[PDB]
Each structure stands twice: as C-alpha cells, then as structure tokens.
C-alpha cells in the first residue's frame, strides 16, 4: 500500500519513516530483500512521520535506507477444522514438513473480550483420580486452574498426568500451546501422541492442535504465541458448539519477554525492573479465556516463581484470575512426598456444603484442622523433644504423621524411572479411607505402611508383609 525507509535498528526495535500513508497501530509490515519472511508490528506514533515497531524474527543484516512495505491489516492465521494434527508457529506457518494448510477462512490475532451479558454461572465438579486435589481443592468444569511451583519441583509431570487421565476420555477437541520451554519435550510429545492414536496421519480423526515457540526465539516472538493459541481455541467455541481443553505451559514467559523490550521503548521502570504496564496487558490477555453462552473452555496453566518467592510482582497478580490454585513446595519434595502439594495453601471456589455435600466437607475440614495443630508444636519438639508432651499431643503428632504419608501417590507416567505401578483412586474410597484414619481405627499400624499406595486396603497388606 505504501513504502517506508528504515531509520534506526537497535536490538529488536526498528523505526520506519513514511512519506505518505502513515499506517495505524497494530498493523503488520513486510521487509523487502530477504531470503526468509520477516514481519514487523506497529507500536507507537512518534511524530514527524515516524513509527516505532517490534520485530518477530532476527534482525541481523539490516541496513539503513532499506525498503518496508505496508499490508493493511493485523497478523492473520489459518483457522478451521483442518488445523487438527498439524504444527504451526507464531505467524501461522507449518513446521511439520507436510505441505500447506488449506482452510477456508482466516482470523486476526487481536480482538476484544466478551461483554458482561454473555457470562455463564454454572458450576460442577471434575474428577481427576488424585487424592489431594479431590479431597482438598477440587476442580470444576469451564473454569481456570493454575499450578504454582519453583524450579525442579514437578509442574510438567503433573500436566502430563492430567493430560493422560482427562484428555483421552474427552469427547471434544484439545489445544496445546508451548511458550518458552524445551524443544526436546515437544518432540517427545509429538511422537507419543503419534503412538497413542490421538494424531492420525492417514485420515481426518485427529483431536489436537499444536502451537510452539520455544526458548531459542527472540523476545518479540515469545510475547505473541499465546494469542496465536487463543485464536484457534476461540474458533472452536464460537463458530461450532464444542467443549475445548486448553493447556498452556509457563505463561510466566509471556510477562518476562515483555520487560526485555520495555527499556528499548523508552519507559521508566517501576519495581524490581519490571515495566509500568504489567497488570493491564495481563488483564487484556486473560479475559479472553472464558466460558460464554455459546460454549465452554477449560484451562490448565503452569506458572513459575523466581527464586522460590511468592511475593514477586509477576506471580502475585495471577491469583486474581483463577478459580482453583495448587501450590508446590520444595521442602515437601525434600522429604520424599510426591506430588509435593502444600495442603495448607491450596484453595477452590466450590468447597461448600451445598455443592460437594456435607460429609466430604466435614472430612476435609477435620483433616485440615489436624494438620494445622501439628505445625504449632514444631519449636518445642525441635529443642526440648518429644518427652515433654502430654499424651494427647503425642496422639495428635502420631495421627498427623500418619495422615501426611497417605497423601502421596504413584503416577503412571513416572513408572519408567521409579520402578512402581500407576494407581487411580475413586472419590468414595478416598473419603472413606480418610474417615477411617480420623476415627483412629488404624492406630496399631506402623506409620511406614501408608507410603506410596492407592486405596486403603493396600496399607493393611503392606503392613502385614512388613511384620
């Protein structure tokens, strides 16, 4: 439509000058004279017919005076029912060496959040087969879920266990978006999805689509992948009536990548070096992943905490965008309890008697009270010792130490490097097993018998063998 000239190149920020026809904000531009396609996005209007842009690829080899062409619309990607079983990238180009993607229509990345009158307020429960989540902080259908944890504590093993347990039996479609992670894990996921049968290469019976931008990409790309996943997630919700599952890995890299360019744009840093616009641009992205009167979306997101700190500005503003929280701890993982879920720091919105029933709620509140009481005796035990306690305190210590063991469980996806067998518990058995321990029926068993088992019946047999 119109042509410009490059005036300055610094890192991942480029400025262009237009003689006539100044493009509007959020439009895409094309660079002339390169082997591979390179696209720029307009961000600011400076003045004197100049704009400041952000690149989506490497910017080595650019010379002042080079030509830039205008397109006239934002970034558009192919969307439809033929994206199932394929692999895309930031700007919607196939990277699975299988030819072009022949869809009928396209869609733009940037849109607006659903209005106030389109919200739904129904609530139900989702069963995962994991004791801690079902007993303490159950999930829901059409809600947001977050997994907090440090480095090396096990977020992605839990995400793969949830995929294995829930995704297979689902009747709808699924979307997996990977942002700022390892490439070899993506290759492993692709090959195991080929083996299982979710991806079929000889017909049209696939039920998953993949979008990837990993940690080897410049910061411009990593700041835009999640919206590329969101668009293909939203098409299946609006145009078709379907239930969609969306998995996002380390949405924290969406925030970090945005602060690597804030300095180059000429802004004053706010706190701990972060950009001043940290909550608004997160709120813009998060409000689109919702459930409306046309469909449902269930979200599972993994979040990262720098230097094992929960007061950092990045993970401290995500608590307000969730309906269920699961917090992982390194100290529990040191003691050998897997999964390392903190039972005194996880919440859910549907833990009330009128939804889950009275019995479940009473059992959960009793186990939480018992767990809280044992934590307040640590200082005395750590110095004076166990002998100073009375009988009731010793009894509470023994029961709390027995309860802690029974919360661990073996996973099926970890059988390869643990030498065990996976287990899957129904809800009623967990409720009854915790009731029986609370009632004191198993005070004559050693505390080492409640370690890494499934239903309660396996504890008595392992205790019987370990005479």
């Amino acid at each position: 439509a119109a042509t410009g000239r490059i005036v300055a190149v610094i890192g991942a920020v480029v400025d262009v000058q237009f003689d006539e026809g100044l493009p509007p904000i959020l439009n895409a531009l094309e660079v002339q004279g390169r082997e591979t396609r390179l696209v720029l996005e307009v961000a600011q209007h400076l003045g004197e017919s100049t704009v400041r842009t952000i690149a989506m690829d490497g910017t080595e080899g650019l010379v002042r005076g080079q030509k830039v062409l205008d397109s006239g619309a934002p970034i558009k990607i192919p969307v439809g029912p033929e994206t199932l079983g394929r692999i895309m990238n930031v700007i919607g180009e196939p990277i699975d060496e299988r030819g072009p993607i022949k869809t009928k229509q396209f869609a733009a990345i940037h849109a607006e959040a659903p209005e106030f009158m389109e919200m739904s307020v129904e609530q139900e429960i989702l069963v995962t087969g994991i004791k801690v989540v079902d007993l303490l902080a159950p999930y829901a259908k059409g809600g947001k879920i977050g997994l907090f944890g440090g480095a090396g504590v096990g977020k992605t093993v839990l995400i793969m266990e949830l995929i294995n347990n829930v995704a297979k039996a689902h009747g709808g479609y699924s979307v997996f978006a990977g942002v700022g992670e390892r490439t070899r894990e993506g290759n492993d996921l692709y090959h195991e999805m080929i083996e299982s049968g979710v991806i079929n290469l000889k017909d049209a019976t696939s039920k998953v689509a993949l979008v990837y931008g990993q940690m080897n990409e410049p910061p411009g790309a990593r700041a835009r992948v999640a919206l590329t996943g969101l668009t293909v997630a939203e098409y299946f919700r609006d145009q078709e009536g379907q239930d969609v599952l969306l998995f996002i890995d380390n949405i924290f890299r969406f925030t970090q990548a945005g602060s690597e360019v804030s300095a180059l744009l000429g802004r004053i840093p706010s706190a701990v070096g972060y950009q001043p616009t940290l909550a608004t641009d997160m709120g813009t992205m998060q409000e689109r992943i919702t459930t409306t009167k046309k469909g449902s979306i269930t979200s599972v997101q993994a979040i990262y905490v720098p230097a094992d700190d929960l007061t950092d500005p990045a993970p401290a503003t995500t608590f307000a965008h969730l309906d269920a929280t699961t917090v992982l701890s390194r100290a529990i993982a040191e003691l050998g309890i897997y999964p390392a879920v903190d039972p005194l720091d996880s919440t859910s919105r549907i833990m009330d008697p009128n939804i889950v029933g009275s019995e479940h709620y009473d059992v959960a509140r009793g186990v939480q009270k018992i767990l809280q009481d044992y934590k307040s005796l640590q200082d005395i035990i750590a110095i004076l010792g166990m002998d100073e306690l009375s009988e009731e305190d010793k009894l509470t210590v023994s029961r709390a130490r027995k309860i802690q063991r029974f919360l661990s469980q073996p996973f099926q996806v970890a059988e390869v490097f643990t030498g065990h067998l996976g287990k899957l518990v129904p809800l009623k058995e967990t409720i009854k097993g915790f009731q029986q321990i609370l009632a004191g029926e198993y005070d004559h068993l050693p505390e080492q018998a409640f370690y890494m088992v499934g239903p309660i019946e396996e504890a008595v047999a392992k205790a019987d063998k370990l005479a």
Partner: protein, 480 residues
C-alpha cells in the same frame, strides 16, 4: 576527499563504547577493523552515528582514528586442523607453533535445530567414574550440570572424562570415537598451562581443542568465548561425527555481561543483573542435540559448571540454569572434608535421559546397589537394621576413586558384583580398598577372557555368573 559510505572517524572513546561518524552502508552485527589492528562489532545503528564494541584494551584507540568495513557478520575459523592447538576467543593461535590452516568459516550466532530434525538419546557416554556410570548415567546428546562450592573437585571430573576417551579414539571403529573441546573463562593462566601439560603427558592433546579467555582479558572477549567454541563443536555434529564441550564457568560470563550492560546505562533488576540473562544461556545450551538418520546422525554433548556460595541453590543464576539442563550432579563440601572423594550426594543427583542408554550388565548390577543404598540412608538416623548398616558402610567404601585414573566398564561391573552378592561382609571396613585393588590386579593379569566376553556380549550370562562366583570365592579364600 574521503568517502563516508565505507569509512568513519571516531568522535568519542570511553566506557568500552566507541562512537563513529560515517559508515553509511554498514550492516547490523558486522565486523569492523580499526587502524591499530583491533576489531569491533557494530551494535547500535543510529541516525547520526554508530555504536561499536571494542574487543580489546581501550588505550589503543584515539579520537580521529579511521575505521573500515569488512563485509561479513562475526565468524570464526572452523575445521579439523584446529585439533591439538590452543587458540584465543577469535581463533588466533597463542601456542607459538605456526598459523592455523583452516579452510572454512562459520558464524558465531546461529539458531538451534527444531523439532523435526531431532531424535531421542540412545548411545552411552562413558566417563570412567564408578559413581557416575552406575548411579547417574549420561547419554550422547544430553546436558548435565556440575554444581558445587569452591575447591570441591569440579574440574577433575572433566579432566578424567577427557582422558578416558583415548581407548575408543585409538581403535578402529569410527562410530565410537569422540572429540573434545575445553573452554576457559576467567581463570588464571598458570592453571591452564599446567592443565595442558597434564593433558599432553597422557597423549590426549591429539583430539582436543582449547579456547582461553583469562582474568586479564577484557570483558567482551570473556563474553564471546563460549559461542565461538560452540560453532567449532557444531562443525562435527552436521558431518556425522560426535563431540563434547565443557564450559568452565558461566557465572563469570554472567558477571562480565553485567559489567558490560551497566556501562550502557540499562535498568538494573534483581542483584543488579539485567533482565536478559536468561536468554544469554538459553540460546547457548539449546544448540546441543541428537540428529536423526536423514540429517546424518551426529551428536553434541555439553557439561556446564556453576559455583554457589555456602550451598545456596535457591539463588538467581543457579535456579535459572537448572530450568534449562536435563539433570544435575551435586558436590558437597562436608563429604570432601571428611574424606569421601568424589563427594557426590546420591540423594539429590538425578538424570532424566541417561537411564535409557546404559549397558545391560551395569543395569543388572546397579539397581540392587541403588535400593540397598536407599535403605541404608533411611535407617542411618534388631538384627536386620544392623545388617542394613553393615551392607551400607561397605557399599560406601567401594565407591571411592583416586585421581587421573579412569576405569573400563567390565572392571566396574566385576567390582560392583562382588559387593552386591554380599561376598565382602566379613572383611573389616578398613580392608575393602586393598582387596579391591588386589582383586582387580589378579583379574586383569590372569583371565582377561571373561572380561572380553562380558565386553563383547554386553550381558552377564548364567555361565559367566557361575565363573565369576568361582573366581571371587577362590581369591577371597586365598586373600589372607
């Protein structure tokens, strides 16, 4: 009477950055040459001037000097003529043996391969240390981290690893040979000289390349070094060969990059580090992979090293790096002081991919040892408990080695077999070492055929098991 399309004049020099007037056809990230022999890199292209980063001392550049273009992005000499040579961060020889006869060049900054060209790790990478090859195996195409405090024994592991490969490299099969590359950042020259003498004495400088950027060198030279070695390693990977690279210290590179950033007046953050430290290592450690058959079948393995203060593993850089590699080895200082050497904490060390690539015999003899060690740890804090402790102490005594002495796989298999069968539950814990030494000597000097069989077959057959039992019981009876 001067052109300003391929020539420039310095307008200011200081704080590392030099601003040049002219050069109107220069490219982003293009090498430029000064009038004193130094070389620089174009970083900031601005409407009025260009910012250049000098790769050297700044007392040799004066205002008014003339700068000229070269016409290429930063690249380094690559090839197989570099084997046996000590070079600097740009490829200039510093060993005084003559010039390098290279014929090919490659860029320092290139993106890593993607999802399709990759495949899983299948082939083993032998070290020579019993604890590593038995409890934390490593495969070809994997990233493993060596973390610990100062003066714990981090470099010795790499030095021992390099020496062991001579066995395969001196053979005939061309699918078991491995080349090695060592990068030194922020060290002292004397240590490097002694290291190369040590390597020369064991005939290991015939398949090794050394890159050095010591403390006296400027920061940009200590910032460019790892990528230069990475490209030289990548040469082999794309031509159907195997290689190994060892980054001595990434913390000093992080410190140098922080120094460079602050003088450019960029907003500091946590611990005054810039916000792009993660990308700096994320790019580098993603270029080691295992190619598939259609692309050639090569490999590249990496072993970064990081130092901690008072065993704080919850800091910024140590946690950043852990979220990149595929496993870690922990070295403690208390074990080093009490005597256990190498001082490896078995509880924390882990490997995610090495388990698949492991010889059957070693797996057969290692699993039981792992379980027994776990039980001994759990009971350390009746007859059965005493039995557990008695087994544990001897098993701990077995996993100790000296220095500059790698071992072959079969000898480790036999030694571990002896312990796991419980044949050494009578000797006092102070006599384990002498028995191990004498037994190994006897076996090497007297049979050699069972060793050859175990090596060729790759599995401990029943007949072999019976013969092993015979040999061990006979020698133990004659031990006296």
């Amino acid at each position: 009477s001067v052109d300003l399309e391929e020539t420039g004049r310095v307008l200011s020099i200081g704080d590392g950055i030099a601003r040049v007037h002219g050069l109107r056809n220069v490219q982003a990230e293009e090498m430029v040459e000064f009038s004193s022999g130094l070389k620089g890199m174009s970083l900031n292209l601005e409407p009025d001037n260009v910012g250049v980063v000098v790769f050297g001392n700044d007392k040799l550049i004066k205002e008014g000097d003339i700068v000229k273009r070269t016409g290429a992005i930063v690249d380094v000499p690559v090839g197989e003529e570099l084997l046996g040579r000590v070079v600097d961060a740009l490829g200039n020889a510093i060993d005084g043996k003559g010039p390098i006869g290279s014929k090919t060049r490659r860029r320092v900054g290139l993106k890593a391969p993607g999802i399709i060209p990759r495949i899983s790790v299948r082939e083993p990478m032998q070290t020579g240390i019993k604890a590593v090859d038995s409890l934390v195996p490593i495969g070809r195409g994997q990233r493993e981290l060596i973390i610990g405090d100062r003066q714990t024994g981090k470099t010795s592991i790499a030095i021992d690893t390099i020496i062991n490969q001579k066995r395969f490299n001196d053979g005939t099969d061309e699918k078991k040979k491995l080349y090695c590359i060592y990068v030194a950042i922020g060290q002292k020259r004397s240590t490097v000289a002694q290291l190369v003498k040590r390597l020369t004495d064991a005939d290991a400088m015939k398949y090794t390349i050394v890159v050095s950027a010591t403390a006296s060198d400027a920061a940009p030279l200590q910032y460019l070094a790892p990528y230069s070695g990475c490209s030289m390693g990548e040469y082999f990977r794309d031509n159907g060969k195997h290689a190994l690279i060892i980054y001595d210290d990434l913390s000093k590179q992080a410190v140098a990059y922080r120094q460079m950033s602050l003088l450019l007046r960029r907003p500091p953050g946590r611990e005054a580090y810039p916000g792009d430290v993660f990308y700096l290592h994320s790019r580098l450690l993603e270029r080691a992979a295992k190619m598939n058959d259609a692309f050639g079948g090569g490999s590249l393995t990496a072993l970064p090293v990081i130092e901690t203060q008072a065993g704080d593993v919850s800091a910024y850089i140590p946690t950043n790096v852990i979220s990149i590699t595929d496993g870690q080895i922990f070295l403690e200082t208390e074990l080093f002081y009490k005597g256990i050497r190498p001082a490896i904490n078995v509880g924390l060390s882990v490997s995610r991919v090495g388990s698949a690539a492991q010889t059957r015999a070693m797996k057969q003899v290692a699993g039981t040892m792992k379980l027994e060690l776990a039980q001994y740890r759990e009971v350390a804090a009746d007859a059965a408990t005493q039995q557990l402790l008695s087994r544990g102490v001897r098993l701990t005594e077995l996993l100790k080695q000296g220095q500059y002495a790698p071992m072959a796989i079969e000898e480790q298999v036999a030694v571990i077999y002896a312990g796991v069968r419980g044949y050494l539950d009578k000797l006092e814990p102070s006599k384990i070492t002498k028995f191990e030494n004498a037994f190994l000597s006897h076996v090497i000097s007297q049979h050699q055929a069972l060793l050859g069989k175990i090596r060729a077959d790759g599995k401990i057959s029943e007949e072999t098991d019976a013969k092993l039992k015979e040999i061990v019981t006979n020698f133990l009876a004659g031990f006296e």
